[model samples]
Target: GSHMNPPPPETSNPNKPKRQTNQLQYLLRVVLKTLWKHQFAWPFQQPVDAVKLNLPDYYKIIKTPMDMGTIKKRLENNYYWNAQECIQDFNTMFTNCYIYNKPGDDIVLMAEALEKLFLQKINELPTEE
Candidate 1:
């Protein structure tokens, strides 16, 4: 009789799958932080100052304009719904580097090096059903 009411429940009920979404974001954040600490991640860490660098056509060449800092903010704001969607931005950032720099250029080399580590970490993430 005393246990008839049970525990009063938690927050009435949470219909949204927000909990899972938060966990996914946390996982992605960890991966991103790891990238930020990487030595080869310098070039992709922030938005390129094309004006100061005298690359007036930078915006034209890189349409999406993805960067690690942008990705961090997007993740924090819940802009991505899935791992692949988030990973796509990372790809875009590296691809832009490749398109704008020569293959032998230091920036291109750094992008390549960082991309390899990024892929390895991405593969280790648990897959969604």
Candidate 2:
């Protein structure tokens, strides 16, 4: 028996809820920033200016409005507890664009492109084993 190597004292589990939260938040932030920097993301960057755009039916038709800016703020405020919630918000943003705008419109095209990008990026996020 080797006496040179002694058993180390047991310590508490290193994993903590806050640590996991920060990691997930950081990953989510990365995805958001990517979308923000994208060229096609301009239209969805902020809430639609319904008044300025003269879209009287915007608010009437779209009950829940979502945008990258609001999502960023929500992320900063820790509004999302998991990746799924964040993904759903992004989905809502795209869906609103689709429902409110014509299928052949330019903004809808941009939304389609960005939505693809989002799905690609989100899937690339590291999975916890």
Candidate 3:
């Protein structure tokens, strides 16, 4: 079975472009800050300290793309131990090393990395399946 749908019409109006007002921006910022603060203020008295931390460095060190391939292969072959190790490492990195610094260029970098990694992973999968 196959299904298809027509795409929506493209907009040509320059004046109809989406706008992010200062109030919207401020509200978003407040939401993010509140989320970060709540996440930080969990167990113990120590806080996450978003400003002082650098998340991109951890991502760089972990080499996520390379590791992603390894994990994918292990999962495909049913190698439980190896797959578990990779999962654990990823979890530790995300929970402990990844620091949420607001308005970080790392966010852009992370998006780029994830997009590339996803494409690579999808390509590696069995197309016929």
Candidate 4:
């Protein structure tokens, strides 16, 4: 058999740990960028503290956490991400928005807002994120 469908775009495996890098930069811009300017960190990490709202382990009850494999962002440490992934990590943003003397609330909220604004009602493909 033979086919020519462009090989369905290269992506990640399963819906765990790692995800497609640079997948969100397309949606997160301007306002979202300004928000992050306040130094807002999402997707809770282990070290290199940014913010730490000391939020209860509530997120643990509804979240599973991911890793540093890449997700639509550019190569190297200096990169960017889309507000799309940020939407799924609501729990993390809500709790860790204003900790460690950082400004996350505005960042997270704006991220969410932009996502909603552009997406309006997601109707695309590559569902595995």
Q: Give the alpha-carbon lDDT of every model.
A: 0.71, 0.72, 0.33, 0.34
- lDDT tens digits, residue span 1-129, model 4: 112111221233343344334434323343234333333234422221212434344243323432122322221222324445555443333333333224545545554553453344343322434
My TM-score estimates for the predictions, one after another, are: 0.76, 0.77, 0.24, 0.26
2 or 4: which has the higher lDDT? 2
Question: Candidate 1: where are CA atoms >4 Å away?
Answer: 1-23
- Model 2 per-residue lDDT tens digits across residues 1-129: 222222221222334222236435654567888889898888877777776677767878887788888777666656555766667788889999999889979999898888888878877877753
Candidate order, TM-score descending: 2, 1, 4, 3
Residue pairs clashing, model 2:
none
TM-score of 2: 0.77
* Candidate of highest TM-score: 2
All models, RMSD in angstroms = 14.8, 17.4, 20.7, 13.5
By lDDT, the best candidate is 2
For model 4, the superposed segments whose C-alpha errors exceed 4 Å read 1-51, 66-70, 73-111, 120-129
What lDDT is reached at residue 123 by model 1? Answer: 73
Clashes of each: 0, 0, 0, 12
As a whole number from 0 to 100, the lDDT of residue 79 in candidate 4 is 35
